[PDB]
Amino acid sequence: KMRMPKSKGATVLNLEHLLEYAPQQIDISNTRATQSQFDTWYEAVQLAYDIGETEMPTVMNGLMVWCIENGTSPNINGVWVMMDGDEQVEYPLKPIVENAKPTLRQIMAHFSDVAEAYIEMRNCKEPYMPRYGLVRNLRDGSLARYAFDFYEVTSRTPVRAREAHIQMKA
Amino acid sequence: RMPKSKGATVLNLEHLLEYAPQQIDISNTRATQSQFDTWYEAVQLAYDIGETEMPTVMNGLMVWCIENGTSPNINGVWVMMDGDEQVEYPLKPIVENAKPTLRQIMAHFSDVAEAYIEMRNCKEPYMPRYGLVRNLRDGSLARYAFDFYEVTSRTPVRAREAHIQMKA
Amino acid sequence: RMPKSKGATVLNLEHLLEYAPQQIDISNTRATQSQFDTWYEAVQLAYDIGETEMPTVMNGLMVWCIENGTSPNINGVWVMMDGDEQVEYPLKPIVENAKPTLRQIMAHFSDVAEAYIEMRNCKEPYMPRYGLVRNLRDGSLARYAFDFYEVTSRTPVRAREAHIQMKA
Amino acid sequence: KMRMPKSKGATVLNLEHLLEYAPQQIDISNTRATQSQFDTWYEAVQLAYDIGETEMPTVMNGLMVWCIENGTSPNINGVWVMMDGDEQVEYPLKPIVENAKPTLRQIMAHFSDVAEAYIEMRNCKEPYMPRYGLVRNLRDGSLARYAFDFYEVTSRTPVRAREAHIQMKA
Amino acid sequence: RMPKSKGATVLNLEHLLEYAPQQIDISNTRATQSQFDTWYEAVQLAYDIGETEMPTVMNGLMVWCIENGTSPNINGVWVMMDGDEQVEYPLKPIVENAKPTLRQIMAHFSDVAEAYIEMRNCKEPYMPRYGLVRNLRDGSLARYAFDFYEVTSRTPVRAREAHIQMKA
């Protein structure tokens, strides 16, 4: 029979709750930073950039698209750019990386679902393979919604996509 | 040729005939009960939690160590979900007091972890992240996809081969 | 062509779009909650047992009705094992108060019965006697081998074929 | 997710005990009479036969071997015989059948394990196919330990034996 | 799992090991000795014959019931040949006192009937009329061609198949 864990003759697990405890893999995964680590980061960039509680969403839109075509391991001393119409708005990367615990990739993994959605609509007008796949010989175009560094391989990910990431990685 | 010292065996074949310890109680792949109790009673004190809800916390920790592993960052935190909310706990007591290794201390959950990784496969496919990261493509072996599994004589040969594949 | 009486639909498509009842809550293959509560609260009174140990009795009854069936002899007794000892209970409250049929009242255990018929297959092969009497030779379908299983949209086609084989 | 049974918001099952409740199939099966129904029968035959608390075992040995070679549905008005050396000791069947609840087959199913053991040793000297298989064209000799009316098909029974019983039955 | 009532087996395995009754003494296909004696001592009285010549009469009756059968007309007569002459006897005592059935009472002659149906095959072919009427075309199975044969573990498979052919 199964040998349930016991300390001093008492099961150390609650079975009424284990049967009804089905966490989504992403919530307890370690490829994504905790929402308590995202909130600290998010608020930190609002403080460094002096952007108000409004307009931050639009700065996060530039970073998301910027982090798809550039990567989530940039230089702490550089500047990421977002297009304000036709011009170029450069922001410092120090708050982005200095306050990204444990790493920016895990902080940016919160955008994974939106990231693939953004690529599809972009790909729904003309070809758009994110640079993370162009500099890694990702040639199939259908698997272009998974060509970004901060993608979270979950139980719902196509197996191909999973194999492709094994290819882009090294 | 029975062992002997001074014209007397140094064994009792009466006892032995009926001495049959299960492999998971003699094996070193799993911490001793005295070690498990010490770890459990130290995590209980370090978390300011009583017996009323400590078992509930252990449900989350097991489910975390199925999806993350038994070699985490000591200066970190393990996550539990209280519904849609997130519950964060330190990993200092978990790793500091888990002698010899947290895997040996978590090997006591091998049977329950096996149940919960198939109890969540019913209804919908589910696969731990110790198999999704280690390139496992067979759902029938999802039961055995966690670091602290106890390989015994009852393990399927196919299961005992996924582990050497995932472990390398 | 939407139904109508007097120039007005007799339906609300707003509601409907988001009205999605699970099949095992609308289906008649399973007794209603008000019927389950009446049966449970009648068996509890007819057995001189409180909430402290009534759940324990229900563990035995489910395991009996997996191995015997849901059409027993009303003037009989269902057996429970308190270790090596035998515990005998009447089947008058079980069948008398189970409206409409005990199978509908036992259909609420279809999910748990499925778990327990696979939770006892781990470790050692196990097969209910509603499959050993109805000529079933495949252990992979042992989960679905009990009278009060609830056939839903999630039932495997192979499982949904064993039942029509066992049911005839 | 699994929908555990509930009455008024409380599970009607104890999960700490269900995981550790693995009854042997025979103990809760209905092909075997309850030990409370065997004890009543057993004691009844001791009262009808006037045999003491000793010597009943030897009368149960004749009935077991008699019920292998004859059947467990005899005439209530007959007499079953056991061999006392070379002679023939006839006993009335009224207490055997009148006090066999629900039926003698279920009362005699308590001897199933011994019954097959008895045949093997009998078959370990010379061929012995119980009459229940001779009058039913049971031709294979290895499956002669399952040729008796009160056999309990369990999870440990060979599948052949199971198919054979389907053949002897009708 | 030995049977038991109150923590004591209800069997003696000492005795059993050496309890080995022949099948034709426990089987119900053949009348008990007390029944045979009652029938024999009733036919003896109903025929006004002593022990001096009763065995001779039984020689004819066995040879009749090999050629006619064990289900005759009670209000009839069975024939014996005293050379070229005919000897007629009633069948009232034969059938009336043969409990439970005359076949069970005549099963005691299965061994002798087998001898006499082969002892008359030596020299010249001979076949009972329970085989000539039931379409049997093999002389090697003439031994087993009578109603009151006792099918035992020693019966040839071919012989045990003629009977089911002749019996249908």
Numbering used by the authors:
A (entry chain Aa), D (entry chain Al): 53 to 222
B (entry chain Ah), C (entry chain Am), E (entry chain Ao): 55 to 222
What does the report in the manuscript say about this coordinate set?
SEC analysis of the P-side mutants trCPK176C, trCPK176S, and trCPK177E indicated the formation of larger particles than double rings. Cryo-EM 2D class averages showed that most of these particles had a cubic shape. 3D reconstruction of trCPK176C with an overall resolution of 3.0 Å revealed the cubes consisted of six orthogonally arranged rings, with no additional stacking of rings as found in trCPE150C. The center of each octameric ring contained a blob of density, which disappeared after removal of the His6-tags (trCPK176C-noHis) without affecting the cubic architecture. Another blob of density was observed in the center of all cubic assemblies, indicating the presence of putative cargo. We measured masses of ~1.3 MDa for each, a mass higher than expected based on 48 copies of the protomers and consistent with a central cargo of approximately 250–350 kDa. Although we cannot assess at this point how important the central protein mass is for self-assembly, our results clearly indicate that no molecular species other than the subunits of trCP mutant are required for the formation of these cubic particles. In summary, the cubic assemblies of selected P-side trCP mutants are composed exclusively of CP-derived units. 48 surface exposed C-termini can be modified to carry (removable) affinity tags such as His6-tag or Spy-tag.
